[PDB]
Amino acid sequence: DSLAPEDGSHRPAAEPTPPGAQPTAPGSLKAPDTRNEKLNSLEDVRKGSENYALTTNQGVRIADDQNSLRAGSRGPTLLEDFILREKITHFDHERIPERIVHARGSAAHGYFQPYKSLSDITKADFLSDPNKITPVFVRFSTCQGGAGSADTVRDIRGFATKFYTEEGIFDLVGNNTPIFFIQDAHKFPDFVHAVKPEPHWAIPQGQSAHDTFWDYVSLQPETLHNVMWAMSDRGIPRSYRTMEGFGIHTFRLINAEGKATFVRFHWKPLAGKASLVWDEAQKLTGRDPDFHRRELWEAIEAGDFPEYELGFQLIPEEDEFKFDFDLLDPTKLIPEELVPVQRVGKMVLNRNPDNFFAENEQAAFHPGHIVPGLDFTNDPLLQGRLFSYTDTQISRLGGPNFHEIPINRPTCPYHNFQRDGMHRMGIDTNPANYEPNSINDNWPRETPPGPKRGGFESYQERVEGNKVRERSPSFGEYYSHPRLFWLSQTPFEQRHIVDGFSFELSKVVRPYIRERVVDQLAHIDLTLAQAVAKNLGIELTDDQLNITPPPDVNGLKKDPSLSLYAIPDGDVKGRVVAILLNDEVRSADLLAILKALKAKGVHAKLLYSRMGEVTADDGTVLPIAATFAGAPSLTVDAVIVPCGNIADIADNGDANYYLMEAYKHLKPIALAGDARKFKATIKIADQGEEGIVEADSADGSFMDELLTLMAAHRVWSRIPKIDKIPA
Amino acid sequence: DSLAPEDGSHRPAAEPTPPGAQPTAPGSLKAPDTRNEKLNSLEDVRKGSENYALTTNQGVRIADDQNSLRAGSRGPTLLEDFILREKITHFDHERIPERIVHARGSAAHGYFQPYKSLSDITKADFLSDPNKITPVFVRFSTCQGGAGSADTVRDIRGFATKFYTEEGIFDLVGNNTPIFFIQDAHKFPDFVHAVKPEPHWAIPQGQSAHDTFWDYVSLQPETLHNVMWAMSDRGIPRSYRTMEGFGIHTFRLINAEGKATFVRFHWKPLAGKASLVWDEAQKLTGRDPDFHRRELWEAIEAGDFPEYE
Amino acid sequence: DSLAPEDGSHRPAAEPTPPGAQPTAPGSLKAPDTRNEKLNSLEDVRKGSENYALTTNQGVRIADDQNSLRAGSRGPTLLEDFILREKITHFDHERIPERIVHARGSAAHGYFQPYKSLSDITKADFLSDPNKITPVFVRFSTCQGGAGSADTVRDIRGFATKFYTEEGIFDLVGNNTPIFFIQDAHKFPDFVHAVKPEPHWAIPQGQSAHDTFWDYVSLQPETLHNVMWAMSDRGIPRSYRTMEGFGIHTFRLINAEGKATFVRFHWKPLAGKASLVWDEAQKLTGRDPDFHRRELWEAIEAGDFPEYELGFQLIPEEDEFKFDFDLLDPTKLIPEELVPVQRVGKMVLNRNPDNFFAENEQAAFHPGHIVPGLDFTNDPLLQGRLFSYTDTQISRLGGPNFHEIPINRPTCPYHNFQRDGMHRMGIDTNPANYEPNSINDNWPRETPPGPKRGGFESYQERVEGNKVRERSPSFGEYYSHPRLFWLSQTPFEQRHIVDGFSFELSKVVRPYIRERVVDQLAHIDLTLAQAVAKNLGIELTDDQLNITPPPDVNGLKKDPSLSLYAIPDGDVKGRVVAILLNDEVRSADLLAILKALKAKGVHAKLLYSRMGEVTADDGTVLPIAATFAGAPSLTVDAVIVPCGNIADIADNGDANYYLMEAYKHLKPIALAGDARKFKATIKIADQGEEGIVEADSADGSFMDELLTLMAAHRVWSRIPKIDKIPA
Amino acid sequence: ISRLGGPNFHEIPINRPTCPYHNFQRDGMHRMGIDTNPANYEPNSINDNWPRETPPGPKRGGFESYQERVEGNKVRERSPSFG
Ligand code: HEM
Numbered sequence A, C: 001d002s003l004a005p006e007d008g009s010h011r012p013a014a015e016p017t018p019p020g021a022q023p024t025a026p027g028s029l030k031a032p033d034t035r036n037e038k039l040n041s042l043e044d045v046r047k048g049s050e051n052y053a054l055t056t057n058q059g060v061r062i063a064d065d066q067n068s069l070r071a072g073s074r075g076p077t078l079l080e081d082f083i084l085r086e087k088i089t090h091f092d093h094e095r096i097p098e099r100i101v102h103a104r105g106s107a108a109h110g111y112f113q114p115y116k117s118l119s120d121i122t123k124a125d126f127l128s129d130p131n132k133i134t135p136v137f138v139r140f141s142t143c144q145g146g147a148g149s150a151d152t153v154r155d156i157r158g159f160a161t162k163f164y165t166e167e168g169i170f171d172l173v174g175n176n177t178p179i180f181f182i183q184d185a186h187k188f189p190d191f192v193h194a195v196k197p198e199p200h201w202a203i204p205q206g207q208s209a210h211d212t213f214w215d216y217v218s219l220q221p222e223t224l225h226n227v228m229w230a231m232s233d234r235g236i237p238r239s240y241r242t243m244e245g246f247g248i249h250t251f252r253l254i255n256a257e258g259k260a261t262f263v264r265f266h267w268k269p270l271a272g273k274a275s276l277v278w279d280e281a282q283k284l285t286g287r288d289p290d291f292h293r294r295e296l297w298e299a300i301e302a303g304d305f306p307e308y309e310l311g312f313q314l315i316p317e318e319d320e321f322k323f324d325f326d327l328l329d330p331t332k333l334i335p336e337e338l339v340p341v342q343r344v345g346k347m348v349l350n351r352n353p354d355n356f357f358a359e360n361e362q363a364a365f366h367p368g369h370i371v372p373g374l375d376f377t378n379d380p381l382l383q384g385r386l387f388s389y390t391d392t393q394i395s396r397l398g399g400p401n402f403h404e405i406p407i408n409r410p411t412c413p414y415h416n417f418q419r420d421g422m423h424r425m426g427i428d429t430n431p432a433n434y435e436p437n438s439i440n441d442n443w444p445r446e447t448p449p450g451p452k453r454g455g456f457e458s459y460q461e462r463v464e465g466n467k468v469r470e471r472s473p474s475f476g477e478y479y480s481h482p483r484l485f486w487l488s489q490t491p492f493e494q495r496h497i498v499d500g501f502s503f504e505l506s507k508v509v510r511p512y513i514r515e516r517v518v519d520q521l522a523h524i525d526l527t528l529a530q531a532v533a534k535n536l537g538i539e540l541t542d543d544q545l546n547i548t549p550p551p552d553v554n555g556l557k558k559d560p561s562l563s564l565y566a567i568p569d570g571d572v573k574g575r576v577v578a579i580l581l582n583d584e585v586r587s588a589d590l591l592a593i594l595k596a597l598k599a600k601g602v603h604a605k606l607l608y609s610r611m612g613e614v615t616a617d618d619g620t621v622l623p624i625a626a627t628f629a630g631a632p633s634l635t636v637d638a639v640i641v642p643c644g645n646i647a648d649i650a651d652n653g654d655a656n657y658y659l660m661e662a663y664k665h666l667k668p669i670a671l672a673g674d675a676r677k678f679k680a681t682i683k684i685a686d687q688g689e690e691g692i693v694e695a696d697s698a699d700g701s702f703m704d705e706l707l708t709l710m711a712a713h714r715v716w717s718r719i720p721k722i723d724k725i726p727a
Numbered sequence B: 001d002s003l004a005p006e007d008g009s010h011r012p013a014a015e016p017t018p019p020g021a022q023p024t025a026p027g028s029l030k031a032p033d034t035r036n037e038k039l040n041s042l043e044d045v046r047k048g049s050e051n052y053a054l055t056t057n058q059g060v061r062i063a064d065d066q067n068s069l070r071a072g073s074r075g076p077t078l079l080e081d082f083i084l085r086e087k088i089t090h091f092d093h094e095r096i097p098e099r100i101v102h103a104r105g106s107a108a109h110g111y112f113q114p115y116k117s118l119s120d121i122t123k124a125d126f127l128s129d130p131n132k133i134t135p136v137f138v139r140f141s142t143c144q145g146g147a148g149s150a151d152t153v154r155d156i157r158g159f160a161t162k163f164y165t166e167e168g169i170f171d172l173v174g175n176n177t178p179i180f181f182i183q184d185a186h187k188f189p190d191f192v193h194a195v196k197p198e199p200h201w202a203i204p205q206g207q208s209a210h211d212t213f214w215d216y217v218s219l220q221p222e223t224l225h226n227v228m229w230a231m232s233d234r235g236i237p238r239s240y241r242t243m244e245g246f247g248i249h250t251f252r253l254i255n256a257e258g259k260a261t262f263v264r265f266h267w268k269p270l271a272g273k274a275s276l277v278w279d280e281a282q283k284l285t286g287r288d289p290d291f292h293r294r295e296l297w298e299a300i301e302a303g304d305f306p307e308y309e
Numbered sequence D: 001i002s003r004l005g006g007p008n009f010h011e012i013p014i015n016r017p018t019c020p021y022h023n024f025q026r027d028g029m030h031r032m033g034i035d036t037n038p039a040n041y042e043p044n045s046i047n048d049n050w051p052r053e054t055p056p057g058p059k060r061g062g063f064e065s066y067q068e069r070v071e072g073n074k075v076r077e078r079s080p081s082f083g
């Protein structure tokens, strides 16, 4: 045949295009000129296709790939069909075990560069010079669900970064909240068992809203801090581009003089912090369970590269015990009001992978993979993680040679006396496979530690204690950080936390677990406890009403850096606006709308009651991106309704529903000319309302008003009004 | 200790109860008196819990299952903590590869019995006497999505039955529509690749609504029949109890005299045929991605046993 | 540091050197200028060592590769030691499952070239042009034992050849005998279980001399033909360089016009056929269980490259039923007297691998791997093999991407829609992973069958019959081929067959199995059966004595091509002679001996009672290779004793034993001057005897005589005399 | 785990303890034991925290390491006493 069309419409343009303009494709075909040392080094295993003959894996050309070999055209298939058997066998063996946690994830390639040399505090080569660029590979993920679960669940998110440094791979394997649920790695199977689907029936997926999770939390108050972050809007990010990242544990930075400095790692999203609202997130898991995966991929194809600032909280070794919390306790955060985040460098994700399985699914990150200039601490959760990644990757990725899988390979040299193992790629020519050896003059050889290019030596921390299985008494405080978090949130963020706990505990079948969680909230803050209790039909006791609130954290009664929205940081580039078309669109409005959006890097999606095209007043042919039902308001940041023949869409139920949903979800809406007739559906004032942009036409200040609302993300003042709308 | 409440409300009643009345539980605890030969034969590997000491896998009692062994209560974790290492090791290796297709599925135990002896057309032992009961294990599934994807997607459903007969295991591995998309098994990897998530970005999950599926369909008209069924409300069943089942292929029955009879296998839902509507099914993928799994489980806990002829 | 010596004696010369002259080494270091297309394409995975730092697999330099990280120098090891954990983990996972059969094997690289274009009979591209060179990788093996078992056991040998052709990989997976034990693949697990170590105790290794094997054989007379070959000296080859190879099955050759020709594949050893004798092979299993592996590696390092001529027996389609046996029956051979072997091309093995595990142990051959121009037949052993190799290789090599392990990769192009699988190396950029597709204009595309570069199409053989599990009546004849083999053997080869059966059946514990085997031998030949029975204390019945011998094969009462030795083909290049020195060797004799050996490509190993050196009469310092006991006569082809101070070695028990062993095992012996005193230890007459070269000095005709004996391999006329020697 | 195929090698007959073994570990390739415990974690109230930890004691007690005193720096160094 064949039938790719004559117009060449099958193939997407190899240039940045806005979401939905062209079919997506493998990164190296979408952006062939985007390169980095790692992307180039993968060239040996990239496999093309065009102009090549179809063959078996042994290189034999196939003549007929449509039929098995049989004795007669209606006869039995013959065992000698080696073509069919290789093809079916490889298909039969396609799947590998998904990760134990973080199985649902989306990744991209990029690069990192420090703003200045950090040689006074660390000898890490990748932070030693502002013009030294280090390729990275980043994988973002949910945490509980399987690899086929949905993106916009309520859950913690993983944020893992593989740095291909000149002195080794450093993996920074963090999450989107600055603490973890538990204190010691020994409890990790217990916690993860409690949050994952229950064992009898394997329900629920991607949800902590079930009895065993809340049983565990209620019995293990150390979890309450991260639970508070998960119940807030932090648990439902708008995009991986708009959430923070944290390494959680205190690590060490080691300089050339041997000085150790404690450090906690942060990633700041340069697109700003932004989250969905629960009803929107939950409905989006049904409308588009691949929303975050798609959003990341389309941002990079559009040139809206995710950018993050690496930042360090630095504490001198002499200040280890100066806080009212233990620095080694992963359930405690270090307030930025106490220890500021120093900016360190920028990370840009600018290329999607070519093959998700080969590059994303087989990537292996490990917090153990550190480099000279970095070291660990005794945090008891970090200590046990050091054992687990290595162990799980051998079974997940089939053997001990997972570092030879292309995405995992260092770009710098690697030489040692390790040999064999399943799927061994490297063919070693060294005469010796042991050291010391004389037969190869002891090569490859050990290298002493030094200021640069030196071997790894651990910091010589003094260890003094008996061999004990004991929690440090300093870790036995569970309510002051949850309280600090609570008081740092805005009133509307506090309401959403309450709503999250209420919704989750309403799904817990055993009422006494609900009551025990409420009792724990009474140890954090009474207003919080009472608001959740009222939603659960629970009444606090007199004793509960008199629980003394936990102490402030080093005199802090709040830290605004813990809130998503108290300090504006809203950027609109990369956001999307739905434009609800009609069959006689006033092109003056459309011109003005698209020009204003284009100027700020905001994308548009043209919607209608059907697919195809509609023609504007002026004759302009407009292509329809999707239908009102086909691409609901859940997927956009704002909605504009231009003037024209509004009767065409005024009696359309889907069109009205579109605005009711967007209104409920606090998204800015802009109506021009006769589009103002839609105000009745969303029942608000004859004279108007903050959050609803309206004018006779879409001109000068109309688009400016709409853009200012989008920079603020959502219209929080509309909260009290949304409860009367049936949406 | 003593974390359970003194009114015993942690434990669900061991008697049929309506959906939502009691917490769900393992079948043998919820219905200890429901038995069959296969269920009885699994007793040798069933492991209890109550009143036993917590141990390693080698039988060593654990004293402190809350902490790793370290040098000092704020010190480094020690390599000799064999208890931590067994526990983390087993956790680290919990997962196995999901099924290539039909990775999302929900299953139950039951039994079969023929209405009358079918010896005139087949010598299969399990079809030879109305009083002969055959334990079964049935797994229903979606077809495209992974094991963690949602139940009420638009897709073909699998309906697989393992009959534990006295002359061997017979597995009847069918779907909820009477035909399949393709004609020759050589094309199965092509079709499946086309319907599954696209390879550059692995989207979309649980959906045939993407370009590669329709490209393949457009190029292979043999697919149109099953496509018609999938696009109908057949592709969004109300429950596994309310859909039909088919073996699809023509098989043979062979009687004692050696006569072969062509046969196609069917399962009729005794609860009747019933499907959702698209907007409902898609929204239900978001509000309860485990809706069919939950519905199956709770119907059985309530005594509303799924029955098929 | 500095472990290597200053004289550079740790490093072997990168030039051809005789066995034992230099330490052996990886092939690319030993022979860097030897190349072929496959060796060159492996360069991307070869890893060096000299002048590089020692690192983890992630690229981090190691400073101390001698110690674990601990709390205090006498303290507990710390979980955070990621360097120790990676190194120990990779060691812990070094082994993979051995092959189910042919686990013990030795391999080398080389090349093949046809003598002329065979386009008239086959369109296979690698046989299309005399100038077309095809790289090969060949693995020879025993069949029963584990990878750690001994080389010189009595067993069939595997001979597998991977051809890296321009139109795909062609694997020719043969054995050193022209038939197999069984007729249908369904019984392979039964046969292999019977031959392998018994299941209760896992004894015996590398031996078919145990009850279950002979039980099976006695019950399944189809096995008798191959058992005859295995009991002959064919089951104990001198080296892989001196055995034959066969494809066994009838396959097909397909030309451009579509004509099918039946073909059986053969390999002829250009060094000639040669085998050990049983006592020598058994003792060598103890002294040097790696004898064949060492002999192959050392021959290539010396430039004595193994050479084999590929040959075809061709039968026209219309002659399928012209013989007394079925061409599809793999327990039947095609006598060369009926169908000559046509010479096709030459194969030369000229480079050893770099890493045994990576290249040899992970190599995967499959008889299924054919190319356009070749096809299968209905042989029911071959048919079942087509299924098995695919299946076993996935578990053995870890997944469905074993074709990406370097040694298995094709050198020609390979492109298809297969994806994923554990350890996926290739990163596919095709936008499509299915066909037919329009999104990549249907590439990679199928190719029609044609005269060259065409897609594979099976020959359209007519199939007619019911679906049955039934053996063809034509295969139900079991004794005529065993009888033809027996009658084709020399008298001393016949005696060795008798002795094989007798030794093996003496180790069968259940006497009735021995008796049943003797009864089977009575159906093949009465002389054979009575000679085995007399060694077992079994007396044939009158009925056994009157069993009619089976018919001749197509009129043939013998075929000399079935004998190892009936038609001389002895070459001496590559063979070794032990020279037994004394403390005052006569230099004149040594000069002449070495020069004559050197001129024919025969190696020498200078032996003495101790290591070090000895000084010859004229001051020549003579380096000692090994001692009389450290390098027994088992390892050499002949023994020369030069003149000098014979008293120094005449009272040496080890020296005398050296000659008694060599004598017993039929090796040529040459004694010069006072060395003739050793004649009494081997009880040879005063006058002399054929096979013992003697003179006053070692020159003119003495070396010619010895080399003439070496060309005839062993001294068969001395068999009657070796019985009286206590050795 | 790689030699014997997964983390349930303790269920291979020759390796099995003859004494009781109960805990919250689940799944893994070739899982033989079918756990009926409502809970797969601890602490839990839904099975009244069983199976439960046991204090160390004279007999039938839980395992507790001997409280050896550790005092030193983190070092990759051979004791001089071993030289
Ligand atoms: C501060 C606490 C933790 C953080 C921030 C964290 C973060 C993550 C992330 C982001 C991933 C996915 C990396 C990827 O995208 O492939 C991951 C995977 C994983 N984590 Fe951790 N995790 C933490 C605690 C733990 C603990 C305590 C353990 C066990 C002791 C653990 C065991 C695992 C395992 C087994 C995997 C799967 C790795 C693989 O298959 O390649 N995690 N974790």
Ligand code: HEM
Residues within 6 Å of the ligand: A088, A092, B098, B099, B100, B101, B102, B105, B139, B140, B141, B157, B158, B159, B160, B173, B174, B175, B179, B180, B185, B188, B247, B248, B249
């Ligand atoms: C009439 C057409 C087909 C039907 C009705 C069918 C039905 C099913 C069902 C219901 C399952 C899941 C069983 C379970 O619940 O575990 C399944 C699994 C599977 N199907 Fe089929 N299928 C069909 C065609 C095919 C074809 C043509 C192939 C390949 C040649 C194939 C390969 C597989 C594989 C590899 C699995 C996973 C099995 C496992 O991992 O246990 N299917 N199929």
Ligand code: HEM
Residues within 6 Å of the ligand: C098, C099, C100, C101, C102, C105, C139, C140, C141, C157, C158, C159, C160, C173, C174, C175, C179, C180, C185, C188, C247, C248, C249, C330, C363, C364, C365, C381, C382, C384, C385, C388, C389, C392, C393, C396
């Ligand atoms: C004419 C009869 C046969 C011949 C000449 C033959 C020859 C060989 C040889 C030479 C090897 C080792 C290849 C290497 O060096 O890696 C081998 C391996 C093997 N053979 Fe065959 N064999 C025969 C019959 C069979 C049959 C009938 C079966 C099964 C139905 C079979 C199954 C195997 C398997 C499973 C392996 C191991 C393959 C691997 O792990 O890569 N063989 N055979």
